[PDB]
Design an enzyme around this catalytic site. Structure first.
Site, short mmCIF file in Angstrom:
data_model
loop_
_atom_site.label_atom_id
_atom_site.label_comp_id
_atom_site.label_asym_id
_atom_site.label_seq_id
_atom_site.Cartn_x
_atom_site.Cartn_y
_atom_site.Cartn_z
N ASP A 24 17.16 3.95 -11.51
CA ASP A 24 17.34 4.72 -12.75
C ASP A 24 16.18 5.65 -13.07
O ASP A 24 15.82 5.81 -14.23
CB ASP A 24 17.66 3.81 -13.94
CG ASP A 24 18.39 4.55 -15.08
OD1 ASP A 24 19.05 5.60 -14.85
OD2 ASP A 24 18.29 4.07 -16.22
N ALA A 33 16.32 -0.12 -26.05
CA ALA A 33 17.52 -0.28 -25.20
C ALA A 33 18.53 -1.19 -25.92
O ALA A 33 19.60 -0.73 -26.32
CB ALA A 33 17.14 -0.82 -23.84
N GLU A 76 14.99 2.41 -31.52
CA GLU A 76 15.98 1.36 -31.26
C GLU A 76 16.05 1.06 -29.76
O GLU A 76 17.04 0.48 -29.29
CB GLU A 76 17.34 1.79 -31.84
CG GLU A 76 18.44 0.73 -31.77
CD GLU A 76 18.00 -0.73 -31.84
OE1 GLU A 76 18.45 -1.52 -30.98
OE2 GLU A 76 17.22 -1.07 -32.75
N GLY A 119 17.11 -3.38 -28.55
CA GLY A 119 16.19 -3.99 -29.49
C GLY A 119 15.28 -2.97 -30.15
O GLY A 119 15.14 -1.84 -29.70
N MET A 120 14.66 -3.42 -31.23
CA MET A 120 13.66 -2.66 -31.96
C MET A 120 12.38 -2.58 -31.12
O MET A 120 12.02 -3.54 -30.46
CB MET A 120 13.35 -3.35 -33.29
CG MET A 120 12.25 -2.70 -34.09
SD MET A 120 12.24 -3.32 -35.80
CE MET A 120 13.86 -2.77 -36.34
N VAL A 121 11.72 -1.43 -31.17
CA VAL A 121 10.40 -1.25 -30.57
C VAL A 121 9.44 -0.86 -31.69
O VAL A 121 9.76 -0.03 -32.53
CB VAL A 121 10.42 -0.20 -29.45
CG1 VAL A 121 9.08 -0.13 -28.72
CG2 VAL A 121 11.55 -0.44 -28.46
N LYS A 157 8.42 -4.53 -27.46
CA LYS A 157 9.87 -4.43 -27.49
C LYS A 157 10.48 -5.80 -27.80
O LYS A 157 10.09 -6.79 -27.19
CB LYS A 157 10.43 -3.96 -26.14
CG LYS A 157 9.58 -2.94 -25.38
CD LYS A 157 10.41 -1.87 -24.73
CE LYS A 157 9.66 -1.10 -23.67
NZ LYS A 157 9.97 -1.62 -22.31
#
EC number: 2.7.11.24
Length: 346
Positions: A142, A28, A26, A30-32, A47
């Site tokens: 990050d 960030a 899932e 969206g679906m990958v 992504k």
């Protein structure tokens, strides 16, 4: 034949170039999936992003796309392709296609012991990538193991520029306990005290944390919340010197640090008894409390620990730095549209 390829009762519309999908996670927001690139004849990662309802995710999507299409570096994840509808009205999603990387340093660390040679090589590649990023006047903000991708030959690529910003040291200062969204365990101390994280020193701190983590397979400063993060750091680094306190002008931050019981430095060699001595010297210089005294990326690359890899002529800097700081979601959609047009058939 073809259609609107589904995955998990979910529209994952990437064809015809990308076939035989496989759901991964899932992501960030969206679906990958992974998929077979019928042009390059190798499997890839894709992504799905759906940001157009929210000004906020529009801005983060545009910035990430801008950054990754501008950058071209072996140790930074590239965008291979961007799939979207041929018109702005029909564009509801965007699919970002990238190299399929087999793992990442977070997964690797929870399962695998790293040899000193692996730690060295990984650190070299992290800093090589970071030198380029920093040369483009960009901060990643990050850096952590899950944002360092690795393939089966241990090639490493920095990813996730979601929180990245053009550098801005003149506007770094802020008050005590200022909110900050990057991952707790890799945040520099000054983020809790007086810094918005607009200087390059915040990324070096994160690299230092990552190095410590590679030496022991676990996070060096696993703070459970804001000020616990800082109590973790000071229990190892020891209480800041008067000199270091004098560089904090903010009274709330300075008085907070003064209110804490004294803590003595923990020697690195006692925390990491099997570590290479040169790795600990370099670790010490990245995990410096005082951001101004913290080692720079170029100096880190030149450090004796990395001398087998160090080659400044093969450590490229960015042709075209982001000179300046980079607005309704309707404009950002058109900007995303324009930025992605180069991938359309034509």
């Amino acid at each position: 034949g073809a259609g609107p390829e589904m995955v998990r009762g979910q529209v994952f519309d990437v064809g015809p170039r990308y076939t035989n999908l496989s759901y991964i996670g899932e992501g960030a927001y969206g679906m990958v999936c992974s998929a077979y690139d019928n042009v390059n004849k190798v499997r890839v990662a894709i992504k799905k992003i759906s940001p157009f309802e929210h000004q906020t995710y529009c801005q983060r999507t545009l910035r990430e796309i801008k950054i990754l299409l501008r950058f071209r570096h072996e140790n930074i994840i590239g965008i291979n392709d961007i799939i979207r509808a041929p018109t702005i009205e029909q564009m509801k999603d965007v699919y970002i296609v990238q190299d399929l990387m087999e793992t990442d340093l977070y997964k690797l660390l929870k399962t695998q012991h790293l040899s000193n040679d692996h730690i060295c090589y990984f650190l070299y590649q992290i800093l090589r990538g970071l030198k380029y990023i920093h040369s483009a006047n960009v901060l990643h903000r990050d850096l952590k193991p899950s944002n360092l991708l690795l393939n089966t030959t241990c090639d490493l690529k920095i990813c996730d520029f979601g929180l990245a910003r053009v550098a801005d040291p003149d506007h770094d200062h802020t008050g005590f306990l200022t909110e900050y969204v990057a991952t707790r365990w890799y945040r520099a101390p000054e983020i809790m005290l007086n810094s918005k994280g607009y200087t390059k020193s915040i990324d070096i701190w994160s690299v230092g944390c990552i190095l410590a983590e590679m030496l022991s397979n676990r996070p060096i400063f696993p703070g459970k919340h804001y000020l616990d993060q800082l109590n973790h750091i000071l229990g190892i680094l020891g209480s800041p010197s008067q000199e270091d306190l004098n560089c904090i002008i903010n009274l709330k931050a300075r008085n907070y640090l003064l209110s804490l019981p004294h803590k003595n430095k923990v020697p690195w060699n006692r925390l990491f008894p099997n570590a290479d001595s040169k790795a600990l010297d370099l670790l010490d210089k990245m995990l410096t409390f005082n951001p101004h005294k913290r080692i720079e990326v170029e100096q880190a690359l030149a450090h004796p620990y990395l001398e087998q890899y160090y080659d400044p002529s093969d450590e490229p800097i960015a042709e075209a730095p982001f000179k300046f700081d980079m607005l309704p979601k309707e404009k950002l959609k058109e900007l995303i549209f324009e930025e992605t047009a180069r991938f359309q058939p034509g």
